[model samples]
Target: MNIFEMLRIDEGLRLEIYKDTEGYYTIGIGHLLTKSPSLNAAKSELDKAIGRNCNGVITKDEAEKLFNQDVDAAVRGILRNAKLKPVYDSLDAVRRCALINMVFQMGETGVAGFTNSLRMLQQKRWDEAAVNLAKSRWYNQTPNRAKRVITTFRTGTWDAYKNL
Candidate 1:
């Protein structure tokens, strides 16, 4: 079976994730981490982590719905763990969506990696939080993406995931 088939992914997404160290095309979901993953690879990895047993073979439409549900939960889980709860509690729908987007893309542990940044956020230390985020291994590894996401988190904007 192909990578997509193996992961049972049928979402409306584009994946292009490459192998870690070996730089191959096919790899496991865990391998998607460590290196920047293509959209499909990310979706594939996410799907595998959050899969449910269907009664039998499912249609593409059904699969998409499942994927969305799992991904949404995954995003929420990330937000819950990231100390973004207060920000989430006080935010408008738009801002909350942005935070969810950030959490989803970063994953739970990656999001939690921002411990100091979360503390900074808790204290309403915007400048300090932004600095902390910038100093992360995340920012150093993915400068282009970190710039955009950090801006959205700091400015309380929405639709950050749309472009992502």
Candidate 2:
């Protein structure tokens, strides 16, 4: 029911720096596009987050703290999506979680482009909504992951779901 649990399902609790979909240096539970005006700035922030320079890794404990902060920001962004919020608010927790997952994966801007899917979700056409999700570039890029989210949306059950 918490944001951490929802984000962890997709982000997988990383403890080391890695490239994200946008190829930005990232660490800890889908924290993408690390902000920096320069390499030194990036290293400074990395050191603060993981107790080491950007080149080093972190521990699970460090990653957890980072996830808490970063995913909270993502949730805030999701809430700010005016076109999506009313419908999102109307959904039950499970469906809301599914939408949050999509937002986390695609970002608010990316998910906003899925007009058909969002419309179906707003209309409560669960199967059509699921199918629409499956037809997206997000689904094509991550089929197994998409299957889980789509299945949950369609069936209204988390039984067949799996984290990315």
Candidate 3:
């Protein structure tokens, strides 16, 4: 799974600044410019893009650049997580991308809480893993996105889908 291929559709491209579901100032394909553990870095990038504020419009090029960087940052976050290393290592390509997609939506630690689901994934018990995901708060909060990801995990294919 080409990671951005899914993210491009799911996160979508928004050139104008706006508040996300949680009220963070975000733009350009799910780039949360106003919240962080890394708020400064992202806010700084946003500032540079629109010249001093997080509330301006950005060009498509700028958004794409930010999206790529965020994707890479998420990947690094996943790679360094101790608890997920083995679980991640044991997955096939489709499922591996599924894990990355999940981590990209939340943070690494956020997804790390799914111990039983992760184990089910490692064991290739696709249905069980999907069931576990369905039981989470994540499913309730973002059913459309979470359902697609769960389908990916359940099917072990890039076909669980996207569109925001």
**Best by the TM-score measure:** 3
Q: Model 1: residues >4 Å from true position, as ranges?
A: 1-12, 15-67, 78-87, 90-92, 158-164
lDDT per residue for candidate 1 within 1-164, as digits (tens), equals 22222123211232333343334332223123234346454445545633633222334454455546655676568556536666566555544554554564556666766677766666666667777888877678667657766665677653434353
Question: TM-scores of the models, in the given order?
Answer: 0.54, 0.81, 0.85
RMSD of each: 8.9, 3.2, 3.4
Worst 10 residues of 1 by lDDT: 2-11
**Tens-digit per-residue lDDT, 13-46, candidate 2:** 6776666664667777886645443555555668
Q: Extract clashing residue pairs from model 3.
A: none
Comparing 1 and 2 on lDDT, the stronger one? 2
Model 2 misplaced stretches (Cα beyond 4 Å): 1-3, 21-24, 34-45, 48-54, 162-164
Please list the residue runs of candidate 3 whose C-alpha ends up more than 4 Å from where it truly belongs after superposition. 36-45, 48-55, 162-164
Which candidate wins on lDDT? Answer: 3
Q: Count the clashes in each prediction.
A: 4, 0, 0
Residue pairs in collision within model 2 = none
